[PDB]
Write a protein that holds these residues in place. Structure first.
Motif, mmCIF file in Angstrom:
data_model
loop_
_atom_site.group_PDB
_atom_site.id
_atom_site.type_symbol
_atom_site.label_atom_id
_atom_site.label_comp_id
_atom_site.label_asym_id
_atom_site.label_seq_id
_atom_site.Cartn_x
_atom_site.Cartn_y
_atom_site.Cartn_z
ATOM 1 N N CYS A 77 5.032 9.477 14.877
ATOM 2 C CA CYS A 77 4.259 10.332 14.812
ATOM 3 C C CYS A 77 4.847 11.648 14.809
ATOM 4 O O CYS A 77 5.775 11.762 15.615
ATOM 5 C CB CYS A 77 3.186 10.329 15.732
ATOM 6 N N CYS A 106 3.616 13.389 18.547
ATOM 7 C CA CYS A 106 4.210 12.768 19.718
ATOM 8 C C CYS A 106 5.500 11.981 19.736
ATOM 9 O O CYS A 106 5.829 11.483 20.733
ATOM 10 C CB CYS A 106 2.837 12.290 20.691
ATOM 11 N N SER A 158 5.571 8.787 19.035
ATOM 12 C CA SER A 158 5.090 7.471 19.405
ATOM 13 C C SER A 158 5.157 6.772 18.130
ATOM 14 O O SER A 158 4.845 7.246 17.060
ATOM 15 C CB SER A 158 3.778 7.573 19.944
ATOM 16 N N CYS A 180 -3.454 7.330 16.054
ATOM 17 C CA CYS A 180 -2.524 7.329 16.866
ATOM 18 C C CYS A 180 -2.557 7.182 18.409
ATOM 19 O O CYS A 180 -3.568 7.454 18.974
ATOM 20 C CB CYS A 180 -1.713 8.561 17.056
ATOM 21 N N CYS A 213 -1.905 10.723 20.821
ATOM 22 C CA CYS A 213 -2.659 11.816 20.595
ATOM 23 C C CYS A 213 -3.878 11.708 20.040
ATOM 24 O O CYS A 213 -4.649 12.767 19.564
ATOM 25 C CB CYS A 213 -1.636 12.949 19.814
#
Ligand SMILES: [Zn+2]
Ligand SMILES: [Zn+2]
Ligand SMILES: [Zn+2]
Ligand SMILES: [Zn+2]
Ligand SMILES: [Zn+2]
Lengths: 32, 387, 293, 445, 196, 356
Positions: free
Chosen positions: F254, F257, F259, F268, F271
């Protein structure tokens, strides 16, 4: 569950023997 | 992991799982619609009839008299199985089933006591259903249109049947019973939980419905991507050169390379193949070298860390300053998680002698980068705001 | 195991090669590509006796199917070569001469927009025709493009090119793209190769091109699952903004028209569908992150 | 086993002779096509580059999934000696045959070909009217002779000599007739492509001293030639072979120019239904076929009763089956012909039978039998009847002085696999005639 | 016998009663049940209060089941005297009037189901004696009665009804009724011109 | 005449296709597919039975729906024993819904259907949906009667207040309440209630529902939705995924963030940001600029070329000219391409080839 068991038994009662499943010519001839 | 030891508020934990809560609530909060329960009850010497709690509850709802008798007798005199065995043999079940009662056969002495009470409930239910009716389907006014109408009274075929003694045969009563049952079922639907003009109009003669969907025209224009032109004379001369080369003859054997760029080409092609092959060689969870006990613990620490990260972003990007205190509390929790992550690495480093520590660190590298990145953004924005 | 159809898309334009030759030291490199293709097509016809060949050339004023030649002869190649190879090569070169003659007559015409996308769509239509006509044939698209010449704008080429990807993915027709020019990366064509199990190759020198074709672009559809592709670049599947022209990782898209926007459009109105956004709703996005006071 | 049979023959050729076989690009282009798809990929890579590549680099190309194929491809490529393994500097370098490499390059690049593909006179002729009829009739004439059905013209002695000398169409002068054998029925079952390779493959082995390389330069070159075209005149051995090939319905001659035929191109690669029939429980046959081939083959093991323009009707009989079995046709081959040439209606109902069988009990997947099971059993039962009486030839050993000697001689026969029966109580055993001499020699020693 | 128990599973059962107010409530319940999709069956008398003004346009009526010819009670002194008077005075045969009287009521109920032309419904006359009354039915009803439907069995009736209901659920083609069954202002003028 | 019969029938079939205008459609969809599993669905009118065929077509519909609506979400509800049973929550994973549907295929349907229970369940499932999404409910109704605990009319009023759109596919005949539900819920439109006449028509009905429904002029919810385009990363060692918490080789990162996520498109897990590739948006552009249909050229005039522009299929000379031209570029096309250009492709090659 009992009805399902009864249905399974009913299906078994109608299933044909094993020798009808496969052509038993190669196997050893029937006898004692 | 997230509520008992971590300390996350229970209310916050359910904020991101509302659909799970709502789905489970509606599953047990819904009820089947009304239906004629007694019609499904077929007696089928020995007769075997099967009942279920759902049907038992349905009987009470559809017939308050049964509930009245059930509630005041089951705990007092005899057990429930006798009651339903008693109820079915009684004439009350036959009367409630919309079947003509026969004086020849008598059922249950106890239940029959409620026969007169039902006659009181039916009258009370008749008023419960009686109400003014629209003049469109008002059948009472049709017969009252001429109050002095006097002709030839209808034959016996047009009147309810009667016996030799002249009294009613009782078949009309069951007709009312089924009529009352249907009326009660519809009324039960309309629980706590101008018009005539539209109906009388002929819709087919009105203007056909016209769609009112909107049209969109999309203009197309955008800037070019953001991080020496040959003249006409050159084109003609260059175009002439290729024509002369092509028309004269075509050379095929010259395509063979010089053997100096081929090796470079092969190295370049193999150079990419090795990189792709390395990725392609490792492109149900994959088998892991970590012991099962350690792997399960790592997943628990990963899941809890991710849950904290999820909650932090919702409040961080909420846009309302009222949740500043919660962000600080979550920020402190994130700091504790970082320490816990560091502690686990130290514990694995000494416990496994760095053999599994390198493998363990890789498994948590993406989350570790995200966690430290999240803290950095919080600090960077905190710095500008506060100072 | 089964025959496969090769549909080579060649992008020839006077502007593209003129800049390529001027910047470089290669004269008449188009002949080098044609002769290399002739051998490559002969090589493809040698890999199997049931595989067909299709050639589509994107010239200045449109596209044309070089092979098979339309129903509507000079000696340019030796007649002692293989009959089947010659029957494809001789017709290919003969149509090339006609194609150049027509372009030369209309040299003064101002062709501003490239027709690379049109050729690929036309080839897919041919692939659809051949696939259904004979029933049990594979397919494969090869794009020979000269990217050395500076392009005017590739924005409009985005929709047609990306659309062809889905159609190729529906018929299981991997499309391979080879680019010869200066720029190392083509954000649109590279996505075409990756999104279609294709291969993207960038080469600066035209010499030794047959080696590239025989080793990289020769991978047939029959053995794709067992052969690792030689593609080296990595794509990101990004799109440029609608008013800034820069790649955006996080941005805003209009719900009505689905047009990307790096920032809130001026005037609180979409610049693509003339749609006005609610002031309250957009204000939510404009809100800064929450920080303690 | 099309490529396998051709590939197998090429392996027995000496490497010195294999090198000569690669001189002509025409043969190389065909030998390149016969290899597996993965093998062809590597060959095309090495042909145009003048360098040596380690085998490890080749392995990198193949994915882990296709590793098994990489073993068959390399083994098959190395067997033909097309891939020369050279080991030096501690690395097993890999290179292609220079003659094969040069030959392939010349053809692909349009270089000098030494007339491997022939020449063109531009005297095209009509193919459907004459070439198709001539070769189809010529290929049908040999089949009618093979099937035994009467036909006025008989095949030339050249092919006839090949048939008798080959396992196909066993003949006996004392009988004075020709009959099909087990492989002969298989030959008739093989598709036209393989049906042509078998006779040609037998021809390759039959020829002796006409050079072995020259014969391959001609047969492979024949596939390169295109039907309906003229070619001037060729090797001296090829001239008599060209006439010989004219007897097989492969090349048509007006009497300077020879014209290949449809079968010539069919040799390289591949390319209601005619021949489909219905089998009833009454052992009746109804073939929706209008063609002598389907009728001729069916008569081998069917007693035909009548025929119509569109279909032929017959009845299976014990006599007809016995006649077919006496010729060496196995019941397994007969059922294979019926199963693989079943009418679509039988397949659809058979599919429904399988669906019904699975619908009732989907646990088991019974075999898809197009024809009723009773016919298969009865045909197999008739085969058992022929195998009822079993007789061997040999000698009986008895009157053994000591049991040890009886066990020793009997055990020795069992070890060499010539013992047919023994009895410890009677101290007697029987051995095959083939092992009689070996047993006697052991007895003396 | 137990037939009603099977009917209750599909639709609510409402029955006409001698009391007018009770019958009116039944109609209200029957209309409510049909509107909400619960489904209802109404049992009435051809010569009753329902048949003399109550309509079942669209949803309130989709099938009419005429159980027998609504013949009057022949063994009635009032009726027998009436028949004799008509025979002697107006030369009307006794059988003709009785059949006419019965049919005028059967048809009366049949016409209380169609409102407009977008309305549809299946009318079944369940009696062996209806087979020869086709000529006595209203012209617009007789024209719709095919020669194959004059004498059907229950099983054959269900199959035809299922096919008919399925056919009537398709979107009608507007062009098929632009000016052949419904007239706009422009079409009406055209008809006035051709006629004149 | 037989071939001409097809042409005249084809012209009638083309008559409806003539009227095509770029109506605004809601690309962002949130569909709730409701299936009827009751006693009435045990009939044999559809072979082998209604339940089996409907489930089989549902699997195909799921595949097609996510193919053309990558950024939409689906939820599955079934009717059993007079109750609505949830079997799949709203999600963007096509495999989870397919797996749930496969399990349902085993249990025999029984009981009565309840529209109110199904509608109420659908009402709650669509509550936590953004205002920019189009809330739609697809119902496969087979029964001719409905048993509900409360007043259905009240539910219909609530659905309209919530701006939900309902499409109903019947099996036997029209139900008055269903017609009202499909009419009152579609701003008075009566074309959203379809009753099939055979097995073949059912497949077309399912395929029709895949395309987004046009929006009404008075229903405006225009807004900008924040999206993200993650960059694919290749890793040497497996790492825990942020969506399923399992070891995977690699995943998209992402950009907000960092992730990692196993697959796209998905929200996600950190976030709550929608991750979509550029290709996913490209899959819906054909609904905003649909390609104009081609009109056959009369045989009276003279044609341009004997071979097709796109596929080089020689035009059959033979009556009616088997040629169709594009108004924008005026290039003749064969009958085959027009089907392929309007079902597979969505761009006219002739227009692209023409320079400007
Ligand atoms: Zn917009
Ligand atoms: Zn995951
Ligand atoms: Zn994120
Ligand atoms: Zn076409
Ligand atoms: Zn156009």
């Amino acid at each position: 569950e009992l009805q399902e068991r009864q249905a399974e038994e009913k299906r078994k009662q109608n299933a044909v023997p094993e020798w009808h499943k496969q052509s038993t010519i190669g196997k050893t001839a029937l006898g004692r | 992991e997230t509520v008992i030891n971590a300390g996350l508020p229970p209310s916050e934990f359910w904020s991101t799982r509302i659909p799970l809560l709502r789905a489970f609530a509606l599953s047990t909060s819904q009820k089947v619609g009304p239906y004629n329960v007694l019609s499904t009850i077929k007696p089928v010497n020995k007769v075997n009839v099967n009942l279920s709690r759902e049907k038992i509850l349905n009987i009470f709802e559809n017939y308050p008299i049964v509930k009245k008798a059930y509630t005041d007798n089951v705990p007092k005199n005899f057990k429930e199985p006798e009651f339903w065995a008693r109820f079915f043999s009684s004439k009350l079940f036959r009367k409630l089933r919309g079947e003509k009662i026969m004086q020849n056969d008598r059922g249950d002495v106890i239940i029959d006591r409620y026969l007169t009470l039902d006659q009181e409930f039916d009258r009370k239910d008749d008023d419960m259903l009686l109400h003014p009716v629209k003049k469109i389907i008002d059948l009472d006014g049709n017969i009252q249109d001429d109050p002095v109408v006097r002709g030839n009274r209808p034959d016996f075929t047009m009147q309810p049947g009667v016996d030799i003694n002249g009294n009613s045969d009782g078949t009309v009563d069951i007709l009312k019973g089924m009529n009352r049952l249907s009326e009660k079922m519809i009324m039960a639907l309309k629980n706590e939980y101008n018009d005539e003009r539209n109906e009388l109009k002929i819709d087919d003669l009105n203007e056909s419905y016209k769609t009112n969907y909107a049209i969109i025209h999309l203009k197309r224009n955008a800037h070019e991507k953001t991080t020496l032109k040959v003249s006409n004379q050159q084109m003609l001369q260059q175009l002439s050169l290729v024509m002369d080369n092509l028309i004269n003859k075509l050379d095929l054997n010259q395509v063979v390379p010089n053997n100096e760029v081929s090796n470079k080409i092969n190295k370049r092609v193999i150079t990419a193949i090795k990189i792709n092959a390395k990725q392609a060689k490792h492109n149900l969870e994959v088998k892991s070298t970590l012991p099962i006990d350690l792997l399960e613990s790592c997943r628990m620490l990963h899941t809890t860390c991710c849950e904290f990260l999820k909650h932090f972003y919702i409040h961080f990007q909420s846009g309302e300053q009222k949740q500043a205190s919660t962000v600080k509390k979550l920020y402190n929790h994130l700091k504790d998680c970082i320490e816990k992550l560091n502690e686990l690495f130290q514990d694995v480093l000494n416990g496994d002698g760095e053999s599994m520590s390198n493998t363990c660190t890789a498994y948590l590298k993406p989350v570790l980068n995200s966690i430290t990145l999240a803290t950095h953004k919080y600090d960077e924005y905190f710095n500008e705001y506060n100072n | 195991e089964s025959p496969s159809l090769l549909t080579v898309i060649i992008e020839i334009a006077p502007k593209l090669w003129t800049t390529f030759d001027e910047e470089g030291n290669e004269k008449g490199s188009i002949i080098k590509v044609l002769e290399a293709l002739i051998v490559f097509l002969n090589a493809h016809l040698a890999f199997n006796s049931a595989n067909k060949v299709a050639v589509i050339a994107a010239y200045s004023q449109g596209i044309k199917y070089l092979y098979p030649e339309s129903t509507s002869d000079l000696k340019i190649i030796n007649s002692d070569m293989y009959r089947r190879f010659r029957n494809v090569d001789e017709t290919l070169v003969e149509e090339i001469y006609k194609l150049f003659e027509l372009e030369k007559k209309q040299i003064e015409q101002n062709s501003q927009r490239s027709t690379l996308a049109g050729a690929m769509s036309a080839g897919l239509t041919y692939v659809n025709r051949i696939s259904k006509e004979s029933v049990s044939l594979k397919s494969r698209l090869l794009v020979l493009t000269c990217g050395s010449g500076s392009s005017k704008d590739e924005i409009f080429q985005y929709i047609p090119i990306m659309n062809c990807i889905f159609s190729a993915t529906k018929m299981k027709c991997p499309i391979d793209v080879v680019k010869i020019g200066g720029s190392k990366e083509s954000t649109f064509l590279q996505q075409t190769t990756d999104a279609t199990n294709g291969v993207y190759l960038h080469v600066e020198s035209t010499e030794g091109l047959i080696q590239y074709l025989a080793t990289a672009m020769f991978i047939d559809p029959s053995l794709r699952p067992i052969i690792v592709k030689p593609n080296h670049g990595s794509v990101d599947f990004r799109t440029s903004c609608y008013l800034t022209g820069r790649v955006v990782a996080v941005g805003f898209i209009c719900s009505v028209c689905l047009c990307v926007l790096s920032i809130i459009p001026p005037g609180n109105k979409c610049p693509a569908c003339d749609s006005q956004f609610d002031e309250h709703v957009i204000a939510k996005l404009k809100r800064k992150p929450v920080v303690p006071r | 086993s099309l490529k396998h049979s051709v590939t197998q023959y090429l392996e027995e050729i000496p490497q010195q002779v294999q090198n000569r076989l690669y001189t002509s690009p025409a043969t190389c282009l065909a030998i390149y096509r016969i290899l597996p798809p993965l093998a062809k990929f590597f060959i095309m890579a090495m042909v145009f580059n003048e360098n040596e590549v380690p085998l490890l680099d080749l392995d990198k190309w193949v994915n882990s999934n296709g590793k098994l194929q990489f073993q068959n491809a390399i083994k098959s490529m190395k067997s033909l000696h097309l891939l020369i393994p050279n080991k030096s500097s501690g690395t097993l370098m890999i290179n292609l045959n220079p003659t094969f490499k040069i030959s392939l390059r010349n053809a692909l690049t349009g270089g000098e070909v030494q007339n491997s593909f022939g020449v063109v006179v531009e005297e095209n002729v009509v193919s459907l009217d004459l070439l198709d009829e001539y070769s189809a009739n010529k290929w049908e004439t040999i089949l009618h002779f093979m099937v035994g059905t009467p036909l006025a013209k008989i095949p030339s002695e050249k092919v006839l000599n090949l048939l008798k000398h080959s396992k196909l169409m066993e003949e006996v002068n004392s009988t004075g007739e020709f009959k099909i054998t087990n492989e002969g029925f298989q030959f008739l079952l093989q598709e036209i492509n393989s049906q042509l390779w078998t006779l040609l493959l037998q021809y390759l082995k039959m020829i002796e001293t006409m050079d072995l390389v020259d014969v391959l330069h001609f047969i492979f070159m024949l596939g390169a030639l295109e039907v309906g075209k003229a070619y001037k005149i060729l090797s001296e051995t090829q001239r008599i072979m060209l006439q010989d090939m004219r007897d097989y319905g492969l090349v048509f001659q007006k009497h300077s120019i020879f014209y290949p035929t449809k079968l010539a191109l069919m040799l390289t690669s591949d390319t209601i239904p005619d021949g489909s029939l219905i089998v009833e429980t009454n052992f009746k046959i109804y073939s929706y076929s209008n063609s002598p081939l389907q009728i001729a083959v069916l008569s081998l093991f069917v007693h035909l009763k009548a025929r119509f323009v569109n279909m032929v009707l017959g009845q299976i009989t014990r006599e007809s089956i016995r006649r077919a079995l006496t010729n060496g046709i196995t019941a397994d081959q007969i059922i294979a012909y019926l199963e693989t040439h079943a009418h679509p209606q039988m397949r659809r109902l058979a599919e429904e039978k399988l669906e019904k069988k699975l619908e009732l009990d989907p646990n088991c997947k019974e075999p898809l039998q197009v024809l009723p099971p009773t016919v298969v059993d009865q045909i197999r039962l008739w085969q058992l009847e022929l195998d009822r009486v079993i007789t061997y030839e040999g000698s009986l050993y008895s009157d053994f002085e000591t049991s040890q000697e009886y066990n020793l001689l009997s055990k020795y026969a069992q070890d060499i696999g010539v013992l047919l029966w023994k009895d410890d109580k009677k101290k007697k055993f029987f051995i095959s005639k083939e092992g009689n001499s070996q047993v006697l020699d052991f007895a003396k020693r | 016998m137990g037939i009603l128990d099977e009917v209750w599973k599909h639709k609510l059962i409402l029955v006409e009663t001698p009391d007018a107010q009770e019958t009116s409530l039944a109609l209200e319940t029957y209309r409510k049940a049909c509107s909400n999709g619960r489904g209802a069956i109404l049992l009435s008398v051809a010569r009753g209060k329902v048949s003399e003004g109550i309509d079942f346009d669209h949803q309130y009526g989709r099938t009419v089941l005429m159980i027998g010819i609504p013949f009057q009670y022949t063994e009635s002194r009032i009726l027998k005297a009436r028949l004799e008077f008509m025979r002697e005075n107006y030369r009307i045969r006794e059988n003709d009037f009785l059949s006419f009287d019965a049919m005028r009521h059967a048809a009366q109920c049949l016409g209380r189901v169609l409102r407009g032309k977008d309305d549809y419904g299946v009318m079944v006359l369940a009696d062996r004696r209806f087979s020869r009354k086709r000529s006595q039915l209203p012209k617009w009803i007789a024209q719709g009665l095919s020669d194959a439907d004059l004498n059907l069995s229950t099983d054959m009736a269900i199959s035809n009804t299922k096919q008919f209901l399925r056919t009537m659920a398709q979107p009608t083609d507007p062009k098929d009724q632009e000016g052949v069954s419904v007239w706009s202002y422009e079409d009406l003028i055209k008809h006035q011109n051709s006629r004149k | 005449a037989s071939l001409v019969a097809s042409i005249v029938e084809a012209r009638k079939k083309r008559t409806a296709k003539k009227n095509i205008t770029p109506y605004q459609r809601g690309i962002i969809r949130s569909l709730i597919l409701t299936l009827d599993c009751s006693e009435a669905m045990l009939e044999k009118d559809l072979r082998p039975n209604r339940h089996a065929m409907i489930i089989q077509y549902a699997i195909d519909f799921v595949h097609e729906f996510f193919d053309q609506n990558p950024i939409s979400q689906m939820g599955i509800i079934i009717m059993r024993n007079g109750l609505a049973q949830l079997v799949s929550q709203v999600s963007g994973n096509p495999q989870d819904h397919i797996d749930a549907l496969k399990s349902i295929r085993k249990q025999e349907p029984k009981g009565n259907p309840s529209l109110q229970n199904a509608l109420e369940m659908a009402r709650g499932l669509l509550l936590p949906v953004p205002a920019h999404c189009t809330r739609e409910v697809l119902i496969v109704f087979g029964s001719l009667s409905t048993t509900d605990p409360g007043d259905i009319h009240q539910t219909i009023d609530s659905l309209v207040s919530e701006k939900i759109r309902v499409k109903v596919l019947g099996l036997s005949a029209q139900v008055a309440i269903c017609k009202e539900l499909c009419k009152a819920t579609n701003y008075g439109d009566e074309s959203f209630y379809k009753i099939l006449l055979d097995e073949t028509h059912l497949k077309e009905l399912f395929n029709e529902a895949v395309t987004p429904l046009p929006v009404n002029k008075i229903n405006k919810g225009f807004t900008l939705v924040k999206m993200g385009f993650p960059t694919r990363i290749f890793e040497d060692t497996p790492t825990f995924c942020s969506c399923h918490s399992k070891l995977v080789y690699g995943g998209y990162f992402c950009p907000n963030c960092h992730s990692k996520v196993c697959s796209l498109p998905t929200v996600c897990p950190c976030c709550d940001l929608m991750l979509i590739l550029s290709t996913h948006l490209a899959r819906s552009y054909h609904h905003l600029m649909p390609l104009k249909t081609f009109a056959e050229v009369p045989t009276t005039e003279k044609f341009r070329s004997e071979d097709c522009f796109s596929c080089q299929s020689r035009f059959p000379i033979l009556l009616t000219s088997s040629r169709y031209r594009c108004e924008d570029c005026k290039q003749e096309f064969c009958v085959d391409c027009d089907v392929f250009i309007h079902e597979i492709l969505h761009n006219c090659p002739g227009c692209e080839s023409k320079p400007v």
